[PDB]
Design a protein around this ligand. Structure first.
Ligand SMILES: C#CCCCn1cnc(N)c2nc(Sc3ccc(C)cc3C)nc1-2
Ligand SMILES: C#CCCCn1cnc(N)c2nc(Sc3ccc(C)cc3C)nc1-2
Lengths: 228, 218
């Protein structure tokens, strides 16, 4: 009938132990920006692949870029991509699932229910590290997104509760996603223009597309500087 | 059965790990970082113990590429490791069936040990098929540890004490990791990972006949 085991499904809490060790993230909090950039690049690859067969895929927004803006006075970091974007359903379900993956009840049992066992595995294997590291540097994450198949919506969470609303400004993105982080007090430095510039350059290996930072050059003029 | 559920959770863990270790060049940041900690440690010892800097006068990190032999060397003049440290400690970080608790020390201190060095060890084996550790601690003779990540051995170094004090990590690089034997690749990776490190870091480099000598990067 089958290949017999035992003890040892209980010894499956090496998984619990491994999840703890991925607390390499506390030691390397700046990885949140690497992940934001990498996920931005993925969302752009995804819409690009779609445009190969769908001539209307890029209609919402012609360009394929990542735009990062610090706002020191308001304590915000924004990372904006013109990639595939996310429907309301994806904001609710898949962020819901991703935020879940850093807990006790989610891991030790499910048990393969009711989503899509392998799809959940892939969702977390890709985005888990990014979501978790963002909440090591931010008290709130706001996700504004526009997918070709839906209207623009805004998801916000403090990691404990979330809400989603239709964006009352309508479609300002054209298509794509803005991730806005309200930074923790200790994460002050990510509001600095130099710091952000140097991190973007350090992680440009993880983008297949132009990445700009809103930056000043001397009145002093502000514009998008191309980082790669 | 849940055998299938567990198998899927297994696969998710692998994907998370891959995601975490998206950047393989990180192995060198960790090696340099461990070297800085070794140096930090013997310096703290030196404040109270006048013979801490007896084996080796200086406090440096030295990196050498041996292209012909396919080797990367990272040498610190830090605290070093005893034979006991090499056997007991590196064995644990390698094995991170044996996953009751409180073994086999200080298991706050096990978590601490895997915690501090685990990442450097995993990232090493992402770019290398073999890791060789030559270490000389003030309280032991020089020893050489070697692993392919599955099994390890340790021997007294037949060359005696050639380091004075400290540790050389030698990597036998994977075929695809060849680029890390290039001078310009390593130089740039050092300058990329040298902010925190206050100790001098050197790379074995050449300048035009060509003169091979240590070059300060930070
Ligand atoms: C790419 C792709 C396809 C899937 C949808 N999608 C599209 N664009 C992004 N930028 C995404 N980021 C996430 S997860 C995520 C991770 C961390 C944080 C802080 C926020 C989010 C939304 N999911 C994303
Ligand atoms: C610092 C300190 C104190 C403890 C002893 N010790 C001293 N010097 C080093 N350079 C160390 N590296 C490790 S772990 C390690 C991690 C990755 C790899 C590839 C090899 C090893 C031995 N342990 C080390």
């Amino acid at each position: 009938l089958r290949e017999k085991s035992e003890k040892f499904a209980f010894q499956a809490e090496v998984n619990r132990m491994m999840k703890l060790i991925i607390n390499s993230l506390y030691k390397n909090k700046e990885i949140f920006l690497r992940e934001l950039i990498s996920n931005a690049s993925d969302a752009l690859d995804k819409i690009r692949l779609i445009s190969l067969t769908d001539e209307n895929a890029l209609a919402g927004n012609e360009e394929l870029t990542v735009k990062i803006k610090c706002d020191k006075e308001k304590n915000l970091l924004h990372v904006t991509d013109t990639g595939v974007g996310m429907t309301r359903e994806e904001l609710v379900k898949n962020l819901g699932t991703i935020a879940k993956s850093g807990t006790s009840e989610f891991l030790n049992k499910m048990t393969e229910a009711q989503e899509d066992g392998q799809s959940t595995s892939e969702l977390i294997g890709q985005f888990g590290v990014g979501f978790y590291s963002a909440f090591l540097v931010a008290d709130k994450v706001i996700v504004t997104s526009k997918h070709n198949n839906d209207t623009q919506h805004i998801w916000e969470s403090d990691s404990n509760e979330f809400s989603v609303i239709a964006d009352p400004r309508g479609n300002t993105l054209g298509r794509g996603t803005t991730i806005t982080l309200v930074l923790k007090e200790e994460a002050s430095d990510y509001l600095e223009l130099d710091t952000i510039k140097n991190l973007v350059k350090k992680y440009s290996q993880f983008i297949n597309f132009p990445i700009y930072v809103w930056s000043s050059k001397t009145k002093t003029v502000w514009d998008w500087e191309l980082m790669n």
